[PDB]
Design a protein around this ligand. Sequence first.
Ligand SMILES: [Mg+2]
Length: 480
Amino acid sequence: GYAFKPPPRPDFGTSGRTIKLQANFMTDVTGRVLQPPSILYGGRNKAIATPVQGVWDMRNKQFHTGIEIKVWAIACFAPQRQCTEVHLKSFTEQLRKISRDAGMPIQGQPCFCKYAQGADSVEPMFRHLKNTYAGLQLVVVILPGKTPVYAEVKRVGDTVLGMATQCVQMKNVQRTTPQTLSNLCLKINVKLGGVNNILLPQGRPPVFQQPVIFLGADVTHPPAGDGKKPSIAAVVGSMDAHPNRYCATVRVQQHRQEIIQDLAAMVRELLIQFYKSTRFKPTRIIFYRAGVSEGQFQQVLHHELLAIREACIKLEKDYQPGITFIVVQKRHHTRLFCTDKNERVGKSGNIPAGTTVDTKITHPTEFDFYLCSHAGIQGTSRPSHYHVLWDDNRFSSDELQILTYQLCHTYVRCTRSVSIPAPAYYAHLVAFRARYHLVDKEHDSAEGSHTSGQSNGRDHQALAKAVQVHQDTLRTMYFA
RNA sequence: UACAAGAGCCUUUCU
RNA sequence: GAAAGGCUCUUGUU
Ligand SMILES: [Mg+2]
């Protein structure tokens, strides 16, 4: 048996605006639209965006902290006949003006602006870049759609040279929209070490009165009928009081293994980074776990919790912070619709962002809820299920649901509220980037096609070093 | 591969 | 049933 059991429901939710809904169980349920957190920005004005219907924009808004870009480069892998230097100059001008309007001043044209062909030319030229322009902060790599050049660029920048690289498709260079450039600039500001925005500090739940770390974990697996290809487990952790900046750890682990075998070491490194950054050990630990089925609830809860506790024991003598273990499930057949036409959203007629249901469709004796935190524009919105497998922090339903909503609003690649909290999304992004690293490790030997070359040519140590990113990359948000 | 979100086709073994 | 992975497609945004 297992010595750990999930805590029951501490109470029912009361905060938010009451909204009748229908669910395919039709079962008439009652949700609560949580009010969106105010998004605090920077600049001279320090604008406070109010997410309207799940969405806010970057018009008249500057970054909370903007990173000036004095040195950057452009490597165009698109065909020169298809992406002319006129197009590149127009893209540079439009991107510079949008970035300056967003509080991210780019001082002048890139020093390097050259054309290259093939993935095999990525690693030399990139190395040449690191050997030519000191203080280089970014390379804009233009790509003609799908190519191995993308994964080779990602591998070289992340796990080889420690270089921040942003890729743009060719079709977004010839025709440029202000929204595309603004989202690009969001990614640039995140990748270079700046914070785009924070939640309004006076509107946060009381859990931020004490030091706290937010952990997001996700394991991706290759298709079945395999065993040469391993699973990839990624755990990210928030590195400051404003839950925006995240550090990442990644591990190659056994084929189709769901529990994170090396979770204790990853959590230990993340806690060490948190103590280095905030100079305070986390009093509370919030763990958002993605990609765990119902039938494997307890095993993960038996292992990973212990691992986290082990990391705490390995952090300092007599250090047992309260641990909150929640599992995120975007995949389920639970659909929610508004009962009256006056509350439907857009053309698609979805439910509003913030719709939280913790009654009548959840587990009667367990702490779980549904939260639709994203604005649906097509079809039927799919809310995210959050089941609290462990709660040493004595959370209430209101505080945990509001914290989940604000974490969903902390996603930084867009000015939108998304379906899952930012740590889970970042764990997914790190897992995908690690899979790109693993794929482009085998780019000179794409398929191998050998007996001994495939029997013991991809041993676990080599892939473990393959997913490990550079030292200059480890502390940054390369995955965004 | 600017981003989010939702329906589809193809490996995929539990069958 | 699920790991979600590719291929796309659709609505788009400031
Ligand atoms: Mg994933």
